[PDB]
Design a protein around this ligand. Structure first.
Ligand SMILES: *[C@@H]1O[C@H](CO)[C@@H](O[C@@H]2O[C@H](CO)[C@@H](O)[C@H](O)[C@H]2NC(C)=O)[C@H](O)[C@H]1NC(C)=O
Ligand SMILES: *[C@@H]1O[C@H](CO)[C@@H](O)[C@H](O)[C@H]1NC(C)=O
Ligand SMILES: *[C@@H]1O[C@H](CO)[C@@H](O)[C@H](O)[C@H]1NC(C)=O
Ligand SMILES: *[C@@H]1O[C@H](CO)[C@@H](O)[C@H](O)[C@H]1NC(C)=O
Ligand SMILES: *[C@@H]1O[C@H](CO)[C@@H](O)[C@H](O)[C@H]1NC(C)=O
Ligand SMILES: *[C@@H]1O[C@H](CO)[C@@H](O)[C@H](O)[C@H]1NC(C)=O
Ligand SMILES: *[C@@H]1O[C@H](CO)[C@@H](O)[C@H](O)[C@H]1NC(C)=O
Ligand SMILES: *[C@@H]1O[C@H](CO)[C@@H](O)[C@H](O)[C@H]1NC(C)=O
Lengths: 48, 226, 328, 49, 28, 48
């Protein structure tokens, strides 16, 4: 999932952009993925 | 009166150039809706101008290779650009020039002389061309083409596939890989095919449908779901 | 935190006391041995002479579009020149321009008035952006401009732009038609008149005009970057290839860390990169000699640090998960 | 028939988020203890499993 | 055990691993 | 005005007109690549 980032491959953005701009893009991937775990864990805790 | 027919599942093309396998890949692009009416045309003993819409799905069941190319443009009165795709002698010619058409363009064929069909340089589609902003040069059969303008590009997809059926579209599935991407950058609202005069061919109209594509292990689309 | 499997836990717990138990540290990861850079081999230099030094740039209403292919980006050679009054790259960060090979590269060259270089950018509007030239909203490329006022100026009326058009263009659309524009109801019948305007109005350029009217030469590149077979490459040499060992790779600008292996996957001629369920690139095609490499990431398998309380004893016993005991 | 235990899972949050990438892995430290409080949740499961 | 039943190769590569249960299917 | 500073270094030099653009974190060109360079985390002002 892109999560609003320009591309979903973490290694593309870093090759395609500077560190200053990648911060804006990557932190959209992290905040998205890191949230997609907190969804998974929350599913387990309930299911467990 | 042009007859209709049923498009079946035809009209799926590789959306992008990235190889995949064993994966169901949802994608949204301009596709031919499944089971949509596709207009059906004749060559017997008939090449109207057609609305180009968003993109056109062209499927020509042929034997003697009658249909040699297409003509694109908004007006076709020589007051605007026009795209001319012509295939003769296996050679492809693409010109965006602005040129004044004959009202029923065709390319010539003379039956059984030392040069079959002759008429290779016959070049009666048009009076003459002035400003040319682009150039390129190079029923047992079924050839399918997808034509679309994406943000000024002009994209063409194709499959050259053998079949045995006389009457109708083959019921089945084939995925169209990309051929070229001529950057003509012109407004195309209408088009007219070309014919070789001494061969039915189909026209669908794409829509922004969303398909789910199934890539098999060799990286080919073996099925689809609209 | 990197000292040894024990101290890897204390950083996790944020504690110097580690209670008796089992703790699973991050999967053990192998640092990349060496760097690989693999680009297609071609010695040619892109026509930076025939794009940037060209003697006549076409007018903006009909702008030339020149496909650039099979060359190495000479980008370091532009530095002795009139340079650039604006260089603005929408898709790429300009630092990466060297590290990264391109795909469909079209230089679109035309001469516009000074004030209007602003108007070339995705989203802008005005006389240039609306009528005679337009850029996509997703545009990926660079927009380069430098004043030609020492050349294009004499009054030079040849450079010319489309003032009137019924509606706005689509991206990268060209309309060179001169047919008269009808302001009111009455047909113009192909002649100027009241509420009839010849749509193309020529710029004047004197050599003495203010910076607003000094003609700038704009050249707008375009490219797809990844996803596509590379043609135009960067000024970066290619190294030797390493198989079956953890490496740090650059293939056609795609970078990462992987273990490059051979593969039987068969790409259609137009396909370059393969991708996975996770869309991380699984397989690439070696650009110099065409063959399909599987990229398998390093760092597989979990670690678990079995320890009695560091309060008691400082010895630990590590549990590597699903490896027969050889590799580590 | 009754279920008793469910498959014990454990996630590496540093590796799932930023795959094997240095420039990204540094950034995940700003978000901090998110990573480290998941594995405290998925461990509490796997213990009572 | 016959009724109840790559996939795990693309799970450990990302991080989603599966720990083994403490008690074997034999001890149970 | 509201805010006092800490390590303040004025870095003064004369560059060609077109090239004031090139002084900013992330830019490249003859000035930014070769003879002067600014950090990606740079904190300060650029006056010309
Ligand atoms: C592409 O050409 C078509 C015509 O071939 C344009 O559609 C016309 O739009 C005008 C309004 O600007 C209408 O008055 C006409 O009736 C339309 N003609 C048809 C046949 O629909 C269309 O606007 C053009 N596209 C662009 C971007 O200019
Ligand atoms: C197809 O054409 C028939 C007429 O032959 C019409 O009844 C039907 O509604 C059309 N359907 C579509 C999807 O165009
Ligand atoms: C096709 O038409 C072109 C017109 O440009 C002509 O030059 C050529 O000889 C013809 N025949 C073939 C086989 O290309
Ligand atoms: C892939 O192609 C091979 C022929 O090289 C064929 O044997 C195999 O069945 C194909 N796989 C699929 C899923 O069609
Ligand atoms: C443009 O021409 C000048 C001399 O007229 C030359 O020095 C320069 O190298 C040329 N530009 C490029 C990019 O080669
Ligand atoms: C690159 O050069 C080598 C020899 O120097 C050659 O074997 C190889 O074919 C070239 N690359 C490609 C893609 O052909
Ligand atoms: C842990 O260390 C404390 C000393 O601070 C000691 O009193 C206690 O007995 C120790 N416990 C174990 C289990 O070693
Ligand atoms: C270790 O490898 C041998 C053969 O190489 C195999 O028989 C054995 O099952 C492996 N260990 C485990 C725990 O499976």
């Amino acid at each position: 999932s892109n999560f609003g980032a320009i591309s979903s491959v973490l290694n593309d953005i870093l090759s395609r952009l500077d560190p200053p701009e990648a911060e804006v893009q990557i932190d959209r991937l992290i905040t998205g993925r890191l949230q997609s775990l907190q969804t998974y864990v929350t599913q387990q805790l309930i299911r467990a | 009166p042009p007859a209709y027919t049923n498009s079946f599942t035809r009209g799926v093309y590789y959306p992008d150039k990235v190889f995949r396998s064993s994966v169901l890949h949802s994608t949204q692009d301009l596709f031919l809706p499944f089971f949509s009416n596709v207009t059906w045309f004749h060559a017997i003993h008939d090449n109207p101008v057609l609305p180009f819409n968003d993109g056109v799905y062209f499927a020509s069941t042929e034997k003697s290779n009658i249909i040699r190319g297409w003509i694109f443009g908004t007006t076709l009165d020589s007051k605007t650009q026009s795209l001319l795709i012509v295939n003769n002698a296996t050679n492809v010619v693409i010109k965006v020039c602005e040129f004044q058409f004959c009202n029923d363009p065709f390319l010539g064929v003379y039956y059984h002389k030392n040069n079959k069909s002759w008429m290779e340089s016959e070049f009666r589609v048009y009076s003459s061309a002035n400003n040319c902003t682009f150039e390129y040069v190079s029923f047992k059969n079924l050839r399918e083409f997808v034509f679309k303008n994406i943000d000024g590009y002009f994209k063409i997809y194709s499959k050259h596939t053998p079949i045995n059926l006389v009457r109708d579209l083959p019921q089945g599935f084939s995925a169209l890989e990309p051929l070229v991407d001529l950057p003509i950058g012109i407004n195309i609202t209408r088009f007219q095919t070309l014919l070789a005069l001494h061969a039915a061919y189909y026209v669908g109209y794409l829509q922004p449908r969303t398909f789910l594509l199934k890539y098999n292990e060799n990286g080919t689309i073996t099925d689809a779901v609209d | 935190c990197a000292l040894d499997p024990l101290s890897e836990t204390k950083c996790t717990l944020k504690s110097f006391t580690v209670e008796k138990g089992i703790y699973q540290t991050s999967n053990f990861r192998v640092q990349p041995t060496e760097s690989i850079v693999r680009f297609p081999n071609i010695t040619n230099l892109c026509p930076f002479g025939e794009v940037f030094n060209a003697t006549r740039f076409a007018s903006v209403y009909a702008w030339n579009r020149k496909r650039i292919s099979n060359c190495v980006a000479d980008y370091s050679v532009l530095y002795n020149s009139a340079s650039f009054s604006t260089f603005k790259c929408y898709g790429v960060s300009p630092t990466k321009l060297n590290d990264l090979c391109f795909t469909n590269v079209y230089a679109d060259s035309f001469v516009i008035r000074g004030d209007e270089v602003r108007q070339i950018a995705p989203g802008q509007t005005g006389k240039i952006a609306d009528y005679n030239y337009k850029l996509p909203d997703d545009f990926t490329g660079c927009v380069i401009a430098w004043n030609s006022n020492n050349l294009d100026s004499k009054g030079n009326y040849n450079y010319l732009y489309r003032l009137f058009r019924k509606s706005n263009l689509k991206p990268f659309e060209r309309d060179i038609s001169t047919e008269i524009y009808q302001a009111g109801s009455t047909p113009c019948n192909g002649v100027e008149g009241f509420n009839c305007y010849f749509p193309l109005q020529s710029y004047g350029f004197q050599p003495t005009n203010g910076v607003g009217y000094q003609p700038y030469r704009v050249v707008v590149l375009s490219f797809e970057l990844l996803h596509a077979p590379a043609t135009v490459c960067g000024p970066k040499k290619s190294t030797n290839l390493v198989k079956n060992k953890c490496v740090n790779f650059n293939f056609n600008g795609l970078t990462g860390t992987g273990v490059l292996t051979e593969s039987n996957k068969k790409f259609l001629p137009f396909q370059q990169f393969g991708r996975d369920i996770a869309d991380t690139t699984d397989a690439v095609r070696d650009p110099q000699t065409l063959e399909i490499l599987d990229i398998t990431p390093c760092s597989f398998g979990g670690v678990s640090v079995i320890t009695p309380g560091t309060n008691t004893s400082n010895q630990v016993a590590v549990l590597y998960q699903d490896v027969n005991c050889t590799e580590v | 028939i009754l279920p008793v235990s469910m498959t014990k899972t454990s996630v590496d949050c540093t590796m799932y988020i930023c795959g094997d990438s240095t420039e990204c892995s540094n950034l995940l430290l700003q978000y901090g203890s998110f990573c480290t409080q998941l594995n405290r949740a998925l461990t509490g499961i796997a213990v009572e499993q | 055990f016959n009724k109840v039943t790559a996939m795990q190769m693309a799970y450990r590569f990302n991080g989603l691993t599966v720990l083994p249960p403490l008690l074997t299917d034999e001890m149970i």
